Design a protein around this ligand. Structure first.
Ligand SMILES: [Fe+3]
Ligand SMILES: [Fe+3]
Ligand SMILES: [Fe+3]
Lengths: 200, 238, 238, 200, 237, 200, 200
């Protein structure tokens, strides 16, 4: 068969990933511009929300060295790929868990609906990639919202998960942090309540 | 805004390391036990950030100067350079390449690293750049040292530089480690050996590149990166 | 005083490097053009100094501590150890082993070295010891860096440690260089290649020695040295 | 045939040899005890002499980075091998040429006569080994004395040199340095007046 | 009065059998699922018992005479001998070597062994000795038979003798099994094959040793044992 | 790299280990001297203690064929390697679980404090090696004491166990058996409450 | 290591080089435009100079079949790469020694000062490449001027020549030829007074 050049293989990000990709989280000096966890300026269109969560290993213990990348549509369902710290909204961001801050946070807006390649609406979602010591190739997942039940039930991606019980692992729980609208999305890498991870 | 106009060749997850590789002990509790769920490519997966409008500092790619506290870092002066292409051999221009590493003695500038090898007051160990219009990148740095780690009772990482590459989409984004030609630690490392195929391991070994050295100044290593092949959509929804 | 009571196996001067090796440019004007004159072994050649009564300082063999100006040197912590034997395999005990080297970046602590890689304020690069009663020696140091030199326009020494060994007589005394397993600079070096026989070059390459490492602390390399075979006199003057 | 373990091959001492073997000559700090160029304490038996010389390459230019080791009998014709800085006499020493001091010196006594292995007296001599950048394996020679002409003419080692003109290269010239008895022994590595070098 | 003056080469746990080797069924539930925790060597790990003054009975090393109930055991008379050295080739003198085995028909003298092959009234199957000052040990015994066991539906252990060796510290202590040259059961055994590397399996196969046989009396097998390399401490704090 | 002679590989002790190493426990006749479970004669210095425990597999079922070897300091923190049944104290012993007696016992004294190689005190501990059918290479663990909380908190070996919850698995529980001080130390080879096992 | 395509290997120009590269010197008809030995028309800015020289082999005999290529800055220290016979000045030229004319000539202007890559002024020089039968790969040298002593003493290229005596081989001697300023630059390929040749 036709064999292309092989992809460079993945390796773990390791325990010091923050020195390269999360300098403030590492407690090291930052450069003038850093890619971080505030996707939305205060006047960006849409509903401003906080996302937060904790990451657990197969023994139920906190992962205190994770690194997460996120990619989401803006409130109007458009992916903003021209990354710029001056943008009202960036569709991309980064966050982390650390020894001092075991819970990651993201400041964003609730994403608008985008269609899949067949033209079928997907429920509002955040695409997440998880990296850490012990993770040899990053784990892909999606964060959906518990107050979008009607859309979630019809999402063509959620419906590829065979078991309803597993679909529940991707549904973030609405809550309030300092009185402000938030959704909590805990990730369980292994075992009971294991979060669905995707390949694509 | 971004559009869905391409597809990416599916990953070979037997070429990449598997999740559960127990000789690398931390992988035991941090590997999913359920199967990954395959999903079709949509705009969510086939787009991603482009960093052409990110503002880079003058020395962001030069680790000899970007942590300057009165002198040069101690260690083997090297250029690390290469090309980012996709699996069809197409260059990947204007793409974000990030790197981080220990100093010449294997010590990282991180609070959690308590290795007794000292920090270097003029070394930080972090770089970034964009590939140029033809897919090439370059950094200047010092060659990192190997270091011990709490895996087996006498385990040592080979000298390495951590890399992250964005590529055209979140589907192409990759984090990996660069190793150095001839290092006798490479065959012994349980992190290297998380990759089952020896030919795949060889793809992570940077080659000494005398052609790119600055005589009387610094050596050079070449590390070419291959991201997932990108093609146009064809015959979809019909 | 010393006595003539032994003979030493004649050197193989095609195993050793020849004097004139023009790719190593300095050898052109510093090589004799007349043949060496062979002379028989006498007490003058078959005796030599023994250094058992030389006073060594506490850190003479420990380059991590013997140039201590407030900290440890930067670089790859290593033990360099091995055995000195003669060609018959007999250990050579209580013999003087001296060594010197550049720092982690290839800079020597000598006025004539103006390489732009900085000096390390806590590294001097000089060691000595005696082999023990079973012929073994050991040093602790940092792995030296390669460095450029004014031979060809882009020539670089492989990482190396210079060694001198006394042995039982002035006939056995040797100066050489230790190189490190896997270094891709070794095949390229005109000083290495002053040795014509590839098998002889391999005798100068120290092997990574995980068995002798201090876990969580330092790696180790093994460099065994072979001096000329010593035998008793037999059937002389009869 | 019988093949023993091969000897470790030689390599050049290189231009920084002094940092390892001639620390004072290198201008670096010395250790409490160093092996250097004063073989004789003032009260050692015998005739106290200074030896000195310069080393030349094949273009007639000074070698300003050489390192020399010497081995000689004491005044009574005995080799003193128990090296000790407290000894009245050491048969071994070291010296060097440098950028600042292109001429090496040795402070010693004139050696007594020793017999070769057949019982034939050798003329008084100093055994010398020469090391430097550009010298891949050290060069062996001997320094004999111009005021021992009768002994030199009968030396079984000098007489192994086929040509009388070449024998002359090993004969040091009596002179006076600061009014004191000295012998000068210049070495020419290559070309006109090339010094005899030995194999044994 | 034991002292911390030595270090032992770290074990290669891919040379040894891994814990989880599911074709050996009992290992499935008796293998840790968490990683081992590496700890540095201290006096706790680098010392161990010396048995120089353990009192041995006259026949403790001689299984032909140490269960004497009126006659000799039935079976192939053999000497089993060898040397204990460390990985540097240094002999391990005055060290405890213990062994146990089935009789000629594969039957052990234990209540839990209900194999229909009979017990031998003159065989117990247990030995011990100390290595001599040069590291050599020897036993006299009968060659044990293979036997079936409840693993797969037709699994048979190759003929084997169980060994335990103390060595200089608790870090060197080892239990293993000796197999016999040429036994066609060896490549088929899931306990043998708990060892992944075929070169490591070969290290457990005792060689026929005609040189050490007593003519007209008994054959001999040679089984050398390598314990972890011991070195002096260096450059520690 | 340098490769030494490979170590002889381990194999399981198998189901009949007691016939070779625990003769009394096997129900077989003993020899005049056996290595067994009484480390301390009543006259030995220190606090006399009974140790007991059960061993469990990954399904929570008793292991009724295990063999244990123990190594501990005397009450003054000294390891006694000269094994002799005439000694008031031996640092080494053996015990077992069997079909008739699923709970192993040891009769010893509480060990004194021993420093690690860096001079840091370790909490009082007994070193244990566990052998059985199904165990291909023996498992190393340590038994610490619940009435040494302060020392345990500072032990440099305990502190190499990343998770506090796992450190708890090595702490034996003080009780009284027939009026005598005892500690229970259960080992769980696999699964919930899995005992920490060491490599060194 | 990284290995590129190998360079095409050199071969000697051979005895008939002039038929291809110095047609007038070969005694053969010329084409309308030839690259020859007049770098400067009389109207060019700068000091007009005649250069001349002879080439010698290792036995001290004239080389009567050499071919030389020269490359130099204009009087303002700028290299002019746009070769055109209509130019008042070209930075490049060719000359030759032949059986009829053993002394090559060049008609040029004195080059201005050019900085090295580190910004350090080089003394005025003409770059020369020498080809001939017996020369397997061409020899690179530089012609400097004896009336630029101060500049020559400070030239970073001259100062890479270890021996002052060898630096003298690159200094052309000012004279007058038919009333016009000239410099003689003889090249000695081998032996006494051997001209310094460069690699770059
Ligand atoms: Fe790393
Ligand atoms: Fe050097
Ligand atoms: Fe058995």
């Amino acid at each position: 068969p036709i064999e292309l050049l092989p992809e460079t293989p993945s390796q773990t990000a390791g325990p010091y990933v923050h020195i390269g990709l999360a300098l403030e989280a590492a407690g090291n000096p930052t450069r003038d511009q850093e890619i971080w966890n505030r996707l939305a300026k205060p006047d960006a269109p849409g509903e401003h929300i906080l996302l937060l969560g904790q990451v657990y290993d197969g023994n139920g213990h906190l992962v205190r060295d994770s690194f997460l990348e996120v990619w989401q549509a803006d409130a109007n369902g458009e992916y903003q790929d021209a990354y710029n710290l001056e943008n009202a909204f960036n569709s991309f961001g980064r966050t982390a868990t650390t020894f001092d801050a075991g819970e990651w946070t993201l400041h964003t807006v609730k994403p608008g609906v985008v269609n899949n390649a067949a033209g079928v609406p997907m429920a509002p979602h955040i695409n997440i990639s998880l990296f850490a010591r012990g993770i040899n190739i990053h784990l892909h997942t999606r964060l959906y919202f518990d107050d979008e039940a009607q859309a979630n039930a019809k999402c063509p991606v959620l419906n590829l998960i065979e078991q309803p019980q597993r679909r529940e692992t991707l549904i973030a729980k609405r809550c309030e942090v300092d009185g402000k609208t938030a959704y909590r999305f805990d990730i369980r890498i292994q075992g009971e309540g294991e979060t669905v991870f995707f390949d694509f | 805004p971004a559009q869905d106009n391409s597809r990416f060749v599916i990953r070979d997850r037997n070429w990449h390391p598997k999740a559960l590789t127990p000789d690398y002990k931390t992988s035991i509790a941090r590997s999913p036990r359920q199967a990954l769920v395959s999903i079709p490519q949509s705009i969510s997966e086939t787009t991603g950030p482009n960093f052409s409008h990110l503002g880079f500092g003058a020395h962001d790619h030069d680790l000899l100067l970007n942590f300057n506290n009165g002198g040069l870092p101690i260690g083997e002066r090297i250029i690390v350079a290469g090309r980012v292409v996709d699996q069809y051999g197409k260059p990947v221009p204007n793409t974000l390449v990030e790197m981080w590493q220990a100093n010449a003695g294997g010590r990282y500038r991180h609070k959690n690293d308590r290795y007794l090898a000292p920090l270097d007051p003029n070394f930080g160990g972090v770089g970034r750049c964009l590939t140029d219009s033809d897919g090439y990148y370059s950094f200047r740095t010092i060659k990192p040292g190997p270091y011990p780690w709490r895996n087996g009772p006498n385990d040592w990482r080979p000298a390495h530089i951590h890399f992250g590459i964005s590529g055209p989409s979140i589907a192409t984004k990759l984090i990996t480690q660069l190793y150095f030609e001839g290092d006798p630690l490479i065959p012994m490392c349980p992190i290297v050996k998380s990759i089952a195929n020896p030919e795949a391991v060889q793809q992570l070994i940077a080659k000494l590149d005398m052609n790119n050295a600055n005589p009387m100044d610094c050596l050079a290593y070449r590390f070419d990166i291959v991201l997932r092949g990108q093609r146009k959509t064809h015959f979809e929804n019909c």
